[PDB]
Amino acid sequence: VFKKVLLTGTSEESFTAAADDAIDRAEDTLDNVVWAEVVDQGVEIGAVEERTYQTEVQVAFELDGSQ
Amino acid sequence: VFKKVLLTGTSEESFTAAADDAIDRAEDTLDNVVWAEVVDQGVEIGAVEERTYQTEVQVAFELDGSQ
Amino acid sequence: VFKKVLLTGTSEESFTAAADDAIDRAEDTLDNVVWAEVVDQGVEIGAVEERTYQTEVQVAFELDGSQ
Amino acid sequence: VFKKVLLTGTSEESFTAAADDAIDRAEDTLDNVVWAEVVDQGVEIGAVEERTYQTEVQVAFELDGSQ
Amino acid sequence: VFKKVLLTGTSEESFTAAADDAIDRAEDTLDNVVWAEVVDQGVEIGAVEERTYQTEVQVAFELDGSQ
Amino acid sequence: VFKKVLLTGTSEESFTAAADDAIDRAEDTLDNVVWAEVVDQGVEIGAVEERTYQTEVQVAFELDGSQ
Amino acid sequence: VFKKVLLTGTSEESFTAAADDAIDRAEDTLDNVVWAEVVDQGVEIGAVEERTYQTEVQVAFELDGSQ
Amino acid sequence: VFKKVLLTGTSEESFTAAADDAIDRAEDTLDNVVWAEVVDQGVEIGAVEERTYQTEVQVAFELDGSQ
Amino acid sequence: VFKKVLLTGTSEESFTAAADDAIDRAEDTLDNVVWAEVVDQGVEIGAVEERTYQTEVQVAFELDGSQ
Amino acid sequence: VFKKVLLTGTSEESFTAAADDAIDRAEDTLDNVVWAEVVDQGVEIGAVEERTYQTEVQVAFELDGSQ
Amino acid sequence: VFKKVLLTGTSEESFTAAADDAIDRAEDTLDNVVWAEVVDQGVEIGAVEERTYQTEVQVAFELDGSQ
Amino acid sequence: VFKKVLLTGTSEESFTAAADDAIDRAEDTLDNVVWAEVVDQGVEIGAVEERTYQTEVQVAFELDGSQ
Ligand SMILES: Cc1cc2nc3c(=O)[nH]c(=O)nc-3n(C[C@H](O)[C@H](O)[C@H](O)CO)c2cc1C
Ligand SMILES: Cc1cc2nc3c(=O)[nH]c(=O)nc-3n(C[C@H](O)[C@H](O)[C@H](O)CO)c2cc1C
Ligand SMILES: Cc1cc2nc3c(=O)[nH]c(=O)nc-3n(C[C@H](O)[C@H](O)[C@H](O)CO)c2cc1C
Ligand SMILES: Cc1cc2nc3c(=O)[nH]c(=O)nc-3n(C[C@H](O)[C@H](O)[C@H](O)CO)c2cc1C
Ligand SMILES: Cc1cc2nc3c(=O)[nH]c(=O)nc-3n(C[C@H](O)[C@H](O)[C@H](O)CO)c2cc1C
Ligand SMILES: Cc1cc2nc3c(=O)[nH]c(=O)nc-3n(C[C@H](O)[C@H](O)[C@H](O)CO)c2cc1C
Ligand SMILES: Cc1cc2nc3c(=O)[nH]c(=O)nc-3n(C[C@H](O)[C@H](O)[C@H](O)CO)c2cc1C
Ligand SMILES: Cc1cc2nc3c(=O)[nH]c(=O)nc-3n(C[C@H](O)[C@H](O)[C@H](O)CO)c2cc1C
Ligand SMILES: Cc1cc2nc3c(=O)[nH]c(=O)nc-3n(C[C@H](O)[C@H](O)[C@H](O)CO)c2cc1C
Ligand SMILES: Cc1cc2nc3c(=O)[nH]c(=O)nc-3n(C[C@H](O)[C@H](O)[C@H](O)CO)c2cc1C
Ligand SMILES: Cc1cc2nc3c(=O)[nH]c(=O)nc-3n(C[C@H](O)[C@H](O)[C@H](O)CO)c2cc1C
Ligand SMILES: Cc1cc2nc3c(=O)[nH]c(=O)nc-3n(C[C@H](O)[C@H](O)[C@H](O)CO)c2cc1C
Ligand SMILES: [Cl-]
Ligand SMILES: [Cl-]
Ligand SMILES: [Cl-]
Ligand SMILES: [Cl-]
Ligand SMILES: [Cl-]
Ligand SMILES: [Cl-]
Ligand SMILES: [Cl-]
Ligand SMILES: [Cl-]
Ligand SMILES: [Mg+2]
Ligand SMILES: [Mg+2]
Ligand SMILES: [Mg+2]
Ligand SMILES: [Mg+2]
Ligand SMILES: [Mg+2]
Ligand SMILES: [Mg+2]
Ligand SMILES: [Mg+2]
Ligand SMILES: [Mg+2]
Ligand SMILES: [Mg+2]
Ligand SMILES: [Mg+2]
Ligand SMILES: [Mg+2]
Ligand SMILES: [Mg+2]
Ligand SMILES: [Mg+2]
Ligand SMILES: [Mg+2]
Ligand SMILES: [Mg+2]
Ligand SMILES: [Mg+2]
Ligand SMILES: [Mg+2]
Numbered sequence: 139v140f141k142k143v144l145l146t147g148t149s150e151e152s153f154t155a156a157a158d159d160a161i162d163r164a165e166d167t168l169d170n171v172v173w174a175e176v177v178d179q180g181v182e183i184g185a186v187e188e189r190t191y192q193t194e195v196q197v198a199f200e201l202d203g204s205q
Numbered sequence: 206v207f208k209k210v211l212l213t214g215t216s217e218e219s220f221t222a223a224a225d226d227a228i229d230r231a232e233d234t235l236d237n238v239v240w241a242e243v244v245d246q247g248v249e250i251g252a253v254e255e256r257t258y259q260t261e262v263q264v265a266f267e268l269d270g271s272q
Numbered sequence: 273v274f275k276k277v278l279l280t281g282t283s284e285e286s287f288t289a290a291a292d293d294a295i296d297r298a299e300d301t302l303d304n305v306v307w308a309e310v311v312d313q314g315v316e317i318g319a320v321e322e323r324t325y326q327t328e329v330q331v332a333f334e335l336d337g338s339q
Numbered sequence: 340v341f342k343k344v345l346l347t348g349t350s351e352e353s354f355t356a357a358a359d360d361a362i363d364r365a366e367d368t369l370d371n372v373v374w375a376e377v378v379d380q381g382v383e384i385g386a387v388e389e390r391t392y393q394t395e396v397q398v399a400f401e402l403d404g405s406q
Numbered sequence: 407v408f409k410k411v412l413l414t415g416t417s418e419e420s421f422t423a424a425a426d427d428a429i430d431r432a433e434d435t436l437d438n439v440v441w442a443e444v445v446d447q448g449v450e451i452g453a454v455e456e457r458t459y460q461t462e463v464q465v466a467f468e469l470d471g472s473q
Numbered sequence: 474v475f476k477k478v479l480l481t482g483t484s485e486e487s488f489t490a491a492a493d494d495a496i497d498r499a500e501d502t503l504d505n506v507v508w509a510e511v512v513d514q515g516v517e518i519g520a521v522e523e524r525t526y527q528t529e530v531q532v533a534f535e536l537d538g539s540q
Numbered sequence: 541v542f543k544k545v546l547l548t549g550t551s552e553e554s555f556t557a558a559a560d561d562a563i564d565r566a567e568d569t570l571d572n573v574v575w576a577e578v579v580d581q582g583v584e585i586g587a588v589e590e591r592t593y594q595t596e597v598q599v600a601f602e603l604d605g606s607q
Numbered sequence: 608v609f610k611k612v613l614l615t616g617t618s619e620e621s622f623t624a625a626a627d628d629a630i631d632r633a634e635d636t637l638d639n640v641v642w643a644e645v646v647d648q649g650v651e652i653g654a655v656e657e658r659t660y661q662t663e664v665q666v667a668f669e670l671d672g673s674q
Numbered sequence: 675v676f677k678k679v680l681l682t683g684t685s686e687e688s689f690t691a692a693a694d695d696a697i698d699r700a701e702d703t704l705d706n707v708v709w710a711e712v713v714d715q716g717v718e719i720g721a722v723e724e725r726t727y728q729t730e731v732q733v734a735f736e737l738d739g740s741q
Numbered sequence: 742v743f744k745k746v747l748l749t750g751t752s753e754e755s756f757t758a759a760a761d762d763a764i765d766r767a768e769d770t771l772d773n774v775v776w777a778e779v780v781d782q783g784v785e786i787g788a789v790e791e792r793t794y795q796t797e798v799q800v801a802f803e804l805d806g807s808q
Numbered sequence: 809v810f811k812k813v814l815l816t817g818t819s820e821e822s823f824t825a826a827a828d829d830a831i832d833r834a835e836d837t838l839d840n841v842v843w844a845e846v847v848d849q850g851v852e853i854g855a856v857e858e859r860t861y862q863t864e865v866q867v868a869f870e871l872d873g874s875q
Numbered sequence: 876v877f878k879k880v881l882l883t884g885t886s887e888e889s890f891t892a893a894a895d896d897a898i899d900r901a902e903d904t905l906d907n908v909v910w911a912e913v914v915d916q917g918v919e920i921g922a923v924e925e926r927t928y929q930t931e932v933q934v935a936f937e938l939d940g941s942q
C-alpha cells in the first residue's frame with residue numbers, strides 16, 4: 139500500500155528546486171519515499187523580498203510503515 | 206514547506222459555514238494554518254433530519270512544524 | 273440504484289439558497305432524494321433587476337422508484 | 340461579442356459576498372456586465388486578522404464597448 | 407468533519423481487490439472509515455513478477471477522532 | 474439522437490458488477506440502450522454491513538423512443 | 541429552476557448541424573428550452589456509410605414545467 | 608511574451624463563424640494576433656429570434672505591444 | 675483491441691473540415707478506422723495567409739491489424 | 742525515455758480483464774512494457790451479443806527500443 | 809479585489825526563466841503584482857533557431873489600481 | 876496534418892532537461908518536429924540512486940511524413 143502527502147516546496151531558484159524542497163522534507167520524516175507527482179506550480183511575488191518559486195507535489199511512500 | 210490536509214466541514218446553515226467548520230478543526234490540531242482551497246461542495250439530504258451543507262477544503266499549514 | 277438529475281437553482285440571496293431551490297424542486301417531484309453535488313455556480317446580472325445567484329447541482333435519488 | 344475579466348473578490352462574511360465584491364468592481368469600471376461564472380473559492384487565514392473568503396469569477400460583459 | 411487519506415492499494419487479481427487493499431489498511435489504523443472514492447487505476451508490469459493492479463482511493467473517515 | 478441517464482449501480486462484489494447493476498436498471502425501463510461510460514467509482518463502508526462497490530455510468534440510449 | 545438533458549445529436553454535414561439535431565429533438569418534447577452547452581464532439585466512421593458528426597450537448601430548459 | 612484575452616464570439620450560422628467573430632473583434636483592437644484556442648461552445652435559444660451559436664476562445668497576441 | 679493516434683487536422687474552411695482532414699490522413703495509412711473523438715480546436719492566425727482552423731482528434735482503429 | 746500507446750482492451754468479463762487485453766496486445770508487439778494507466782472505462786451494449794467491458798489504458802514502454 | 813492577466817513568457821533556458829519573463833512584463837506595466845499560477849508549459853521547436861521554453865501563467869495583481 | 880507522440884523524458888538535473896530528453900529522442904527518429912506540450916511532471920526517488928526528474932510531453936510533428 140502506498141500513501142501520499144500533499145506538500146508545497148519552495149525555492150528562490152527554480153521549480154525543480156522547489157519540488158526537491160518538498161521531497162527533502164518528506165524524506166526527513168518518512169521512510170520509503172518512492173516517487174512524487176507534480177500537481178501545481180506558482181510564484182510568490184508580493185509578500186517576499188525575492189520571488190519564490192513553489193511546486194506542489196503528491197509525495198508517495200510505501201507503508202508497512204509511516205502513515 | 207506547506208502541507209495540506211483534505212477535510213470536509215459540515216453545517217446546517219451554509220457552504221461558507223461548512224468551510225469554516227473544517228478550518229476550525231484544522232486550527233484545533235495544527236499550528237500555522239495559512240489558507241484553504243475549496244475543492245468540492247454538496248448537500249446531505251436523506252440520512253439527516255435537516256439538510257447538511259458540506260464543503261471540502263484542502264487546508265494548508267506551514268511546516269517547521271505540524272506534519 | 274441511484275439516479276441523478278442536473279438542476280440549476282436560483283436565488284436572489286446566496287449560493288447556498290440557490291442550491292436549496294434546486295433541491296426543493298427535486299423533492300416536489302421525486303421520492304427518495306438522498307444527496308446533491310454542486311457542479312457549477314454563477315450569477316445572472318444583465319437581464320434581471322436584482323443579481324440572481326445560481327447553483328447547479330446533480331441531485332441524486334434512490335430508485336425502486338422515481339426515474 | 341462578450342469579453343471576460345478574471346477577478347477575485349473578497350469578503351469577511353461569505354463566498355456569495357466575495358463574488359459580489361468582484362462583480363461590484365467590474366460594474367464600477369465596465370459597461371454592460373451580463374454574468375459571472377465562479378471558477379474558484381478559498382479562504383485567506385494566516386496573514387489576515389479575520390478569515391477572508393475569496394471567490395474568483397470570470398465576469399462577462401458585452402462589447403460594442405469596454406474591452 | 408470528515409478527513410481523507412490518499413492511499414494506493416495493490417492486488418494481483420483485480421482493480422476492485424486493489425481498492426479493498428487500501429481500505430483494509432485504512433481500517434487497520436483509523437476509526438470511523440465511512441467511504442472511499444476512486445481517483446486513479448493502473449497496472450505495474452515491468453518490475454514485478456506478476457502484473458499488479460493498483461487502485462488509488464481517497465478514503466474518508468469521520469473525526470471527533472483519528473486525524 | 475442519443476440521450477444519456479446518469480445512474481449509480483451498486484454491488485457487494487465488484488466495480489464491474491456495480492456497472493452492470495446500473496445498466497440492468499436502464500434496460501428494464503428504456504428501449505435501445507447502446508452503451509455506458511463510466512464516470513465515477515467508489516465504495517460505501519460505514520452505513521452498510523458489507524462494503525458496497527458503486528459505479529456511476531452515463532447510460533446512452535437511442536431515441537425515436539424513450540426520453 | 542432550470543433542468544438539463546444530455547443529448548447527442550448527429551449530422552452527416554457538420555458539428556454545428558449535429559448540435560442543432562439534438563436541440564431540435566429537445567424542442568419537440570420540452571417547453572421553454574433556453575440554451576445548450578457543448579460537452580463533447582466526435583465522428584462515427586466504421587459502422588456508417590457516410591461519416592456522421594456527433595455533438596453532445598447539455599440542453600437546458602426552464603421548469604415551472606417539463607421535468 | 609504573449610497575452611490572451613477571453614472572448615465569446617457569436618454567429619447565427621456556425622461554431623466556426625462564431626470563433627471568427629471573436630477573432631475579428633480582437634484584430635480590430637489589437638496588434639499581432641497570432642492564434643486562438645477554443646475553450647467552450649454553446650447555443651443561445653430562448654432569448655433570441657434565431658438560435659445563436661457561440662464559441663469562446665482565448666485569443667493570443669504578441670506583446671512588445673498591445674496589453 | 676482499439677488503438678488511437680492523436681492527429682491535428684487543418685482546414686481553411688471550418689472545424690468540421692479540419693476534423694475530416696485528420697481522419698482522411700488516418701484512413702490513408704491505417705485499416706479499420708472506426709471513430710474519432712475531438713480533443714481540442716484552435717485557429718492559426720499570425721503565420722498563415724488565411725486563418726487556418728485546426729481540430730485535434732483521437733482517431734481510433736481496430737487492431738488484428740495496423741498498430 | 743518512455744513512450745505510451747493508447748489502447749482500448751475489451752472483455753466480456755470485467756474491467757480488469759479488459760485492461761489485461763490491452764496490455765497483452767502491447768506485450769505482443771513491444772519490448773520493455775513497464776506500466777499502464779487507466780484513462781477511461783465503458784461498456785458496449787447494443788451492437789454486441791454479450792455486454793463487452795472496455796478499458797482504455799496508456800501503456801508505457803521503455804525505449805532504447807520499440808517506438 | 810485581485811485581477812489576473814494570462815501571459816505566456818518565453819526563454820531559451822528553462823521553464824522557470826520563461827515564467828519569470830511573463831512576470832517581468834507584468835511588473836513593467838502593472839502595480840501590485842502579488843503572485844502567479846502556472847497553467848501550461850511547452851516548447852517551440854520548429855520555427856525558432858533554438859528551442860524556446862514557454863510557461864503560461866495567470867499573474868495576479870491587487871486592484872485599487874491597475875485593471 | 877500534425878501527429879503527436881506521448882514521451883516521458885528523464886534527467887537527473889531538472890524538469891526542463893527532462894523535457895529536452897524526450898524532444899531529443901523525437902528528433903532522432905522523426906522529421907519535422909514542431910512543438911511539445913508538457914502534460915505531466917514527476918520525480919522517481921526510490922528505485923534510482925539519484926532522484927530522476929521526469930517530464931511527459933506530447934511532441935508534435937508535421938506529416939507529409941513520419942507517422
Ligand atoms: C500559486 C499561488 C497562489 C496564490 N493564490 C492566492 C489567492 O488565491 N488569494 C490570496 O489572497 N493570496 C494568494 N496567494 C498569496 C499572495 O501572493 C499573498 O502572499 C497573500 O495574498 C498575502 O495575504 C498565492 C500565492 C501563490 C504562490
Ligand atoms: C456530496 C455528497 C455525495 C455523496 N455521494 C454518495 C455516493 O456516491 N454514494 C452513496 O451511497 N452515498 C453518497 N452520499 C451519501 C448519501 O447521502 C447517504 O448518506 C448514503 O448513501 C447512506 O449509505 C453522498 C453525500 C453527499 C453530501
Ligand atoms: C453562469 C452563467 C453563464 C452564462 N453564460 C452565458 C453564455 O455563455 N452566453 C450567453 O449568451 N449568455 C450567458 N448567460 C446569460 C446572460 O447573462 C444573459 O442572460 C443572456 O446572454 C441573454 O440572451 C449566462 C448566465 C449565467 C448566470
Ligand atoms: C485560495 C488561496 C490559495 C493560496 N495559495 C497559496 C500558495 O499556493 N502559496 C502561497 O505561498 N500562498 C498561498 N496563499 C496565500 C497564503 O495564505 C499567505 O497569504 C501567503 O503565503 C503569504 O506570502 C493562498 C491564499 C488563498 C486564499
Ligand atoms: C499507474 C502507474 C504509473 C507509473 N508511472 C510512472 C512514471 O511516470 N515514471 C516512472 O518512472 N515509473 C512509473 N511507474 C513505475 C514503473 O512501472 C517502474 O516500476 C519504475 O519506472 C521503476 O523505477 C508507474 C507505475 C504505475 C502502476
Ligand atoms: C463514493 C462515495 C462518496 C460519498 N461522499 C460523501 C460525502 O461527500 N459526504 C457524506 O456525508 N457522505 C458521503 N458518502 C456517504 C457516506 O458513506 C455515508 O453513507 C453518509 O455520510 C451517511 O449520511 C459517500 C459514499 C460514497 C460511496
Ligand atoms: C465519439 C465516439 C466515441 C466512440 N467510442 C467508442 C468506444 O469507446 N468503444 C466502442 O466500442 N465504440 C465506440 N464508438 C463506436 C464505434 O465507432 C462503433 O460504432 C462501435 O465500436 C460498434 O460496436 C464511438 C463512436 C463515436 C462517434
Ligand atoms: C452556453 C450558454 C450557457 C448559458 N448558461 C446560463 C446559465 O447558467 N444561467 C442562465 O441564467 N442563463 C444562461 N444562459 C443564458 C440563457 O440562455 C438566457 O439568455 C438567460 O437565462 C436570460 O436571463 C446561457 C447561454 C448560453 C449560450
Ligand atoms: C491552437 C493553437 C495553439 C498555439 N499555441 C502556441 C503556443 O503556446 N506558443 C507558440 O509559440 N505558438 C503557439 N501557436 C502557434 C502560433 O500561432 C505561431 O504559429 C507560432 O508562435 C510561430 O513560432 C499555436 C497555434 C494554434 C493554432
Ligand atoms: C464507452 C463507449 C462510448 C461510446 N460512445 C459512442 C458515441 O459517442 N457515439 C456513437 O455513435 N457510438 C458510441 N459508442 C458505440 C455504440 O455503442 C454503438 O456501437 C455505435 O453507435 C454503432 O455505430 C460507444 C461505445 C462505448 C463502449
Ligand atoms: C506549447 C505549444 C503549442 C502549440 N500548438 C500549436 C497548434 O496547436 N497548432 C499549430 O499550428 N501550431 C502550434 N504551435 C506552434 C508551432 O510550433 C509553429 O510555430 C506553428 O505551427 C507555425 O504556424 C505550438 C507551439 C507551442 C510552443
Ligand atoms: C511520476 C511518477 C509516478 C509513479 N506512479 C507510480 C504508481 O502509481 N504505482 C507504482 O507502483 N509506481 C509508481 N511509480 C514508480 C515507483 O517510483 C517505483 O519505481 C515503482 O513502484 C517500482 O515497481 C511512479 C514514478 C513516477 C516518477
Ligand atoms: Cl489530496
Ligand atoms: Cl454562501
Ligand atoms: Cl449529466
Ligand atoms: Cl462547424
Ligand atoms: Cl494521447
Ligand atoms: Cl473489476
Ligand atoms: Cl482566463
Ligand atoms: Cl526548471
Ligand atoms: Mg538566489
Ligand atoms: Mg495551487
Ligand atoms: Mg439551523
Ligand atoms: Mg466530493
Ligand atoms: Mg433580496
Ligand atoms: Mg454552468
Ligand atoms: Mg464581520
Ligand atoms: Mg485559485
Ligand atoms: Mg493470483
Ligand atoms: Mg496515478
Ligand atoms: Mg458477497
Ligand atoms: Mg461520485
Ligand atoms: Mg450529405
Ligand atoms: Mg463522448
Ligand atoms: Mg442566417
Ligand atoms: Mg461557457
Ligand atoms: Mg477558402
Ligand SMILES: [Mg+2]
Binds near residue numbers: 714715716730
Ligand atoms: Mg491543443
Ligand SMILES: [Mg+2]
Binds near residue numbers: 753754
Ligand atoms: Mg462470459
Ligand SMILES: [Mg+2]
Binds near residue numbers: 781782797
Ligand atoms: Mg472513452
Ligand SMILES: [Mg+2]
Binds near residue numbers: 820821
Ligand atoms: Mg542559451
Ligand SMILES: [Mg+2]
Binds near residue numbers: 848849850864
Ligand atoms: Mg497552452
Ligand SMILES: [Mg+2]
Binds near residue numbers: 887888
Ligand atoms: Mg547530476
Ligand SMILES: [Mg+2]
Binds near residue numbers: 915916917931
Ligand atoms: Mg504521469
Ligand code: NA
Binds near residue numbers: 410
Ligand atoms: Na491528501
Ligand code: NA
Binds near residue numbers: 276478479546
Ligand atoms: Na444528466
Ligand code: NA
Binds near residue numbers: 880
Ligand atoms: Na497518444
Ligand code: NA
Binds near residue numbers: 344345613812
Ligand atoms: Na483571462
